Scaffold this active site. Sequence first.
Site, PDB file in Angstrom:
ATOM      1  N   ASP A 104     -13.568 -56.629  13.740  1.00 58.28           N
ATOM      2  CA  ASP A 104     -12.583 -56.078  13.950  1.00 58.28           C
ATOM      3  C   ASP A 104     -12.628 -54.687  14.619  1.00 58.28           C
ATOM      4  OD1 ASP A 104     -10.587 -55.435  15.124  1.00 58.28           O
ATOM      5  OD2 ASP A 104      -8.715 -56.794  13.933  1.00 58.28           O
ATOM      6  N   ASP A 122     -12.297 -51.918  21.260  1.00 58.41           N
ATOM      7  CA  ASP A 122     -11.112 -52.874  20.691  1.00 58.41           C
ATOM      8  C   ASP A 122     -12.067 -54.710  20.103  1.00 58.41           C
ATOM      9  OD1 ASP A 122      -9.521 -54.023  18.559  1.00 58.41           O
ATOM     10  OD2 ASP A 122      -8.167 -54.194  19.972  1.00 58.41           O
TER      11      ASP A 122
HETATM   12  C1  LIG Z   1      -9.528 -49.175  13.206  1.00 58.50           C
HETATM   13  O1  LIG Z   1      -9.217 -49.250  15.253  1.00 58.50           O
HETATM   14  C2  LIG Z   1      -7.825 -48.426  14.892  1.00 58.50           C
HETATM   15  C3  LIG Z   1      -6.717 -47.996  14.217  1.00 58.50           C
HETATM   16  C4  LIG Z   1      -5.709 -47.647  14.092  1.00 58.50           C
HETATM   17  C5  LIG Z   1      -4.395 -47.811  15.566  1.00 58.50           C
HETATM   18  C6  LIG Z   1      -5.936 -49.505  16.459  1.00 58.50           C
HETATM   19  C7  LIG Z   1      -4.509 -49.981  17.205  1.00 58.50           C
HETATM   20  C8  LIG Z   1      -3.561 -49.796  17.421  1.00 58.50           C
HETATM   21  C9  LIG Z   1      -2.772 -50.141  18.832  1.00 58.50           C
HETATM   22  C10 LIG Z   1      -3.482 -51.789  19.137  1.00 58.50           C
HETATM   23  C11 LIG Z   1      -4.655 -51.864  18.013  1.00 58.50           C
HETATM   24  C12 LIG Z   1      -4.549 -53.725  18.233  1.00 58.50           C
HETATM   25  C13 LIG Z   1      -4.090 -54.372  19.350  1.00 58.50           C
HETATM   26  C14 LIG Z   1      -4.811 -54.700  20.168  1.00 58.50           C
HETATM   27  C15 LIG Z   1      -4.300 -55.185  22.079  1.00 58.50           C
HETATM   28  N1  LIG Z   1      -2.593 -55.296  21.572  1.00 58.50           N
HETATM   29  C16 LIG Z   1      -1.770 -55.672  20.548  1.00 58.50           C
HETATM   30  C17 LIG Z   1      -3.081 -55.496  19.487  1.00 58.50           C
HETATM   31  N2  LIG Z   1      -6.356 -53.886  18.331  1.00 58.50           N
HETATM   32  C18 LIG Z   1      -6.387 -54.834  17.497  1.00 58.50           C
HETATM   33  N3  LIG Z   1      -7.311 -55.300  16.939  1.00 58.50           N
HETATM   34  N4  LIG Z   1      -5.234 -54.718  15.866  1.00 58.50           N
HETATM   35  C19 LIG Z   1      -5.408 -55.910  15.314  1.00 58.50           C
HETATM   36  C20 LIG Z   1      -3.985 -56.328  14.569  1.00 58.50           C
HETATM   37  F1  LIG Z   1      -3.066 -56.255  13.983  1.00 58.50           F
HETATM   38  F2  LIG Z   1      -3.461 -57.470  15.930  1.00 58.50           F
HETATM   39  C21 LIG Z   1      -2.479 -54.535  15.074  1.00 58.50           C
HETATM   40  N5  LIG Z   1      -3.530 -54.176  16.544  1.00 58.50           N
HETATM   41  C22 LIG Z   1      -3.881 -54.151  16.942  1.00 58.50           C
HETATM   42  C23 LIG Z   1      -4.827 -51.554  17.070  1.00 58.50           C
HETATM   43  C24 LIG Z   1      -6.655 -49.272  16.076  1.00 58.50           C
HETATM   44  F3  LIG Z   1      -7.482 -50.151  16.781  1.00 58.50           F
END
Ligand SMILES: COc1cccc(-c2cccc([C@@]3(c4ccncc4)N=C(N)N4CC(F)(F)CN=C43)c2)c1F
Length: 372
Positions: free
Chosen positions: A218, A36
């Site tokens: 991202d 991530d």
């Molecule tokens: C393509 O990759 C993904 C697809 C589906 C889900 C995730 C996923 C799952 C849990 C958390 C996150 C998180 C996240 C990571 C850490 N803490 C909270 C959220 N990682 C990212 N980049 N985001 C973008 C957002 F819009 F913020 C929403 N949430 C996230 C992503 C993912 F990385």
Amino acid sequence: GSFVEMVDNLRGKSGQGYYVEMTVGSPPQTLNILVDTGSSNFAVGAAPHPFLHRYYQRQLSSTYRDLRKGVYVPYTQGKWEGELGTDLVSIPHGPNVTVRANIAAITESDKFFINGSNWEGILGLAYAEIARPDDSLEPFFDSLVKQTHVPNLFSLQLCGGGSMIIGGIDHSLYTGSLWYTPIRREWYYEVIIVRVEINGQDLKMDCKEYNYDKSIVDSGTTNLRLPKKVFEAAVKSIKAASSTEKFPDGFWLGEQLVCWQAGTTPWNIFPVISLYLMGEVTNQSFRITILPQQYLRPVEDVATSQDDCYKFAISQSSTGTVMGAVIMEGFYVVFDRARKRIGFAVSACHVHDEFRTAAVEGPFVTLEDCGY
Ligand SMILES: COc1cccc(-c2cccc([C@@]3(c4ccncc4)N=C(N)N4CC(F)(F)CN=C43)c2)c1F
């Protein structure tokens, strides 16, 4: 632990995330971890959950050190909460090293873990500024670089599997030249978009609109997410180019599938999207060109398998542009932290056809500041 042995170390999809195998604790506990670039905590499931195959058991690790500090992460989509500690971490198909790193043991969560994603935690590769609870919690990559001789760079080749090359660039993963865009500020991997074209037609907006309020790279977001004004213009242009077929509004809202008989997707009716990124020199830029094979995300479902079904993988954002996995899949992306820049080159694995190919090309000259 050479770059050769790092090739093909990722698994997963744009829809559920790409992941790398890691080990936590002593003796090592194997986990699949989401790669991530949009977050900065190394956070792992540390308690049973219906969607978790396995989880981190701190009681089994003698190297675990409790930091006596909670971490509560509510966000627009859901939440995760747990507690901080440090432990020994390794990447079996990464560099040949073991480091002591901060670990957030997730003990409670909401809509965070995904059913059948095959990952149990997240590797936040972005900077300390956005780490939770605050910027004093050193992210994993920073610890890796401080503790070893690993160069301060990583690269990602996402294949719509894939590869994460830590500490270098693997020439077998791309073709042509690498074009660099500056990292505007070290928090998210923030970049600047200077122009957007849809089938060679300029959206003709002030370039600040493309970066309202930031534009980031991202790997943890599926879609290309665009600010409302940009999103509405993009949809208007894509609808015009594809007007020979009419799809429901739900499709354009990225909520509903569009299906065609297997093997008949009319790729040719959909236009190319070009995102022009700020170059390393004044008023020079390069473009990355996205095909519909990137922005129309296939949804694998045995029940709909007489057809090929897709979600429109471009969606509205109220938090700036997000160049997600569907965008990265066309390219080899170099996160050159050492030189505060992001490189793009055509990926050896991108999906295209006999008429069009995704591209990374330049230079382009525009004789204003595009950032917020
Ligand atoms: C393509 O990759 C993904 C697809 C589906 C889900 C995730 C996923 C799952 C849990 C958390 C996150 C998180 C996240 C990571 C850490 N803490 C909270 C959220 N990682 C990212 N980049 N985001 C973008 C957002 F819009 F913020 C929403 N949430 C996230 C992503 C993912 F990385």
